[PDB]
Design a protein around this motif. Structure first.
Motif, mmCIF file in Angstrom:
data_model
loop_
_atom_site.group_PDB
_atom_site.id
_atom_site.type_symbol
_atom_site.label_atom_id
_atom_site.label_comp_id
_atom_site.label_asym_id
_atom_site.label_seq_id
_atom_site.Cartn_x
_atom_site.Cartn_y
_atom_site.Cartn_z
ATOM 1 N N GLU A 27 50.415 38.451 36.051
ATOM 2 C CA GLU A 27 49.957 37.205 35.486
ATOM 3 C C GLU A 27 48.442 37.229 35.260
ATOM 4 N N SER A 28 47.659 37.682 36.258
ATOM 5 C CA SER A 28 46.206 37.633 36.110
ATOM 6 C C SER A 28 45.659 38.540 35.014
ATOM 7 N N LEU A 29 46.310 39.656 34.800
ATOM 8 C CA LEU A 29 45.790 40.689 33.918
ATOM 9 C C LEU A 29 46.327 40.576 32.505
ATOM 10 N N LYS A 30 47.213 39.599 32.271
ATOM 11 C CA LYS A 30 47.887 39.473 30.964
ATOM 12 C C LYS A 30 46.869 39.384 29.797
ATOM 13 N N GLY A 31 46.974 40.318 28.857
ATOM 14 C CA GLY A 31 46.144 40.249 27.665
ATOM 15 C C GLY A 31 44.771 40.861 27.905
ATOM 16 N N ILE A 32 44.552 41.391 29.102
ATOM 17 C CA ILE A 32 43.277 42.009 29.426
ATOM 18 C C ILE A 32 43.485 43.527 29.335
ATOM 19 N N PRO A 33 42.894 44.155 28.321
ATOM 20 C CA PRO A 33 43.142 45.570 28.118
ATOM 21 C C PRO A 33 42.503 46.464 29.169
ATOM 22 N N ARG A 50 40.025 46.890 36.547
ATOM 23 C CA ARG A 50 40.147 45.414 36.384
ATOM 24 C C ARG A 50 40.220 44.719 37.743
ATOM 25 N N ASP A 51 39.086 44.223 38.181
ATOM 26 C CA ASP A 51 38.970 43.597 39.515
ATOM 27 C C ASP A 51 39.294 42.137 39.415
ATOM 28 N N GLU A 52 40.142 41.651 40.349
ATOM 29 C CA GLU A 52 40.637 40.273 40.349
ATOM 30 C C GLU A 52 40.011 39.512 41.512
ATOM 31 N N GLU A 83 47.518 33.905 47.850
ATOM 32 C CA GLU A 83 48.237 32.797 47.190
ATOM 33 C C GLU A 83 47.410 32.250 46.037
ATOM 34 N N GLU A 84 46.073 32.288 46.191
ATOM 35 C CA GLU A 84 45.110 31.812 45.217
ATOM 36 C C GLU A 84 44.982 32.668 43.945
ATOM 37 N N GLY A 85 45.554 33.871 43.953
ATOM 38 C CA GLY A 85 45.449 34.791 42.840
ATOM 39 C C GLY A 85 46.393 34.419 41.731
ATOM 40 N N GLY A 86 46.480 35.273 40.746
ATOM 41 C CA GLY A 86 47.433 35.081 39.657
ATOM 42 C C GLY A 86 46.748 34.479 38.451
ATOM 43 N N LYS A 87 47.494 33.790 37.594
ATOM 44 C CA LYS A 87 46.891 33.266 36.383
ATOM 45 C C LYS A 87 45.769 32.316 36.798
ATOM 46 N N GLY A 88 44.619 32.528 36.158
ATOM 47 C CA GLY A 88 43.450 31.748 36.423
ATOM 48 C C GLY A 88 42.407 32.494 37.161
ATOM 49 N N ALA A 89 42.802 33.567 37.826
ATOM 50 C CA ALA A 89 41.825 34.363 38.558
ATOM 51 C C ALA A 89 40.762 34.925 37.655
#
Length: 109
Positions: free
Chosen positions: A46-52, A59-61, A68-74
């Motif tokens: 989810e976090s990396l979607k669309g990030i080449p 790719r550091d998140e 739990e705080e990770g994922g889309k929006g990170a």
């Protein structure tokens, strides 16, 4: 308080990963990682979607996929592999003693 224990991130060892965490926290992302291991594969998707991908970079998140705080929006930032490979490994090991659901405050250096 907002956390159960604290992790002090070694920014001199992994300087671009540390700067990313610090900048992300400063911008308003959670400085707490509530450990949640089962959902990490999906969070990362989810976090990396669309990030080449980018040669020579990771790719550091932040928040991390293992939180739990990770994922889309990170916050996602490219960090040089030369100087930051191993940061994941290191944080994983440093948190391995803690139970899922443990809230970890991250402090950079």
């Amino acid at each position: 308080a907002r956390y159960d224990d604290i992790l002090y991130f070694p920014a001199s060892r992994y300087p671009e990963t540390g700067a990313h965490i610090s900048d992300a926290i400063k911008a308003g992302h959670s400085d707490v990682c509530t450990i949640e291991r089962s959902g990490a594969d999906k969070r990362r998707q989810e976090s990396l979607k669309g990030i080449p991908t980018k040669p020579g970079f990771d790719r550091d998140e932040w928040p991390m996929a293992m939180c739990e705080e990770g994922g889309k929006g990170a916050s996602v930032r490219y960090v040089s592999s030369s100087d930051n490979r191993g940061a994941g490994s290191w944080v994983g090991n440093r948190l391995s003693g803690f139970a899922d659901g443990t809230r970890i405050l991250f402090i950079v250096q």
